[PDB]
Design a protein around this ligand. Sequence first.
Ligand code: K2P
Length: 171
Amino acid sequence: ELRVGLEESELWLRFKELTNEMIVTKNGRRMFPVLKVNVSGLDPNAMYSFLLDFVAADNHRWKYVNGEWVPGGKPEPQAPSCVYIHPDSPNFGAHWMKAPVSFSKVKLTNKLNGGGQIMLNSLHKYEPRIHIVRVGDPQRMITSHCFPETQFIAVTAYQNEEITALKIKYN
Ligand SMILES: O=C(O)c1ccccc1OC(F)(F)F
């Protein structure tokens, strides 16, 4: 059975309980926490690529008012569907299953200015999604794995002081 498990789920849930925020910048910013997953049930002999994209969690934008996140507007036109290819791709099933798969180098941006970055809209909520694909597969089989523990709001600057403090404590 294919099984994809979120690593450091307790750490993600500490951020999610505050409402998680990730900074987006012109030139792009790495995530904290880093999305990491454990994988079993691939064919160890087959080759696969790991892809990451970000799905809009909501049909509205958000704002931080009186220490709380609340609806802040109609949603802006959706960011383009940017896909990050895990840099170990393509690789054997055995490679992906021997140790957790870490998306440490993905960068979130608010400007289409190159570098294989992911464009997000500030003050919109996103859910990370991992895709597995098999090299050679005539079926072009894709799996999709959603991690609701890792939902966050994209911001140009941290709104919640408790998030600023969590990011410093655990990073
Ligand atoms: O080996 C395959 O057929 C395959 C194809 C696309 C994605 C995952 C796959 O691995 C598994 F889900 F475990 F089957």
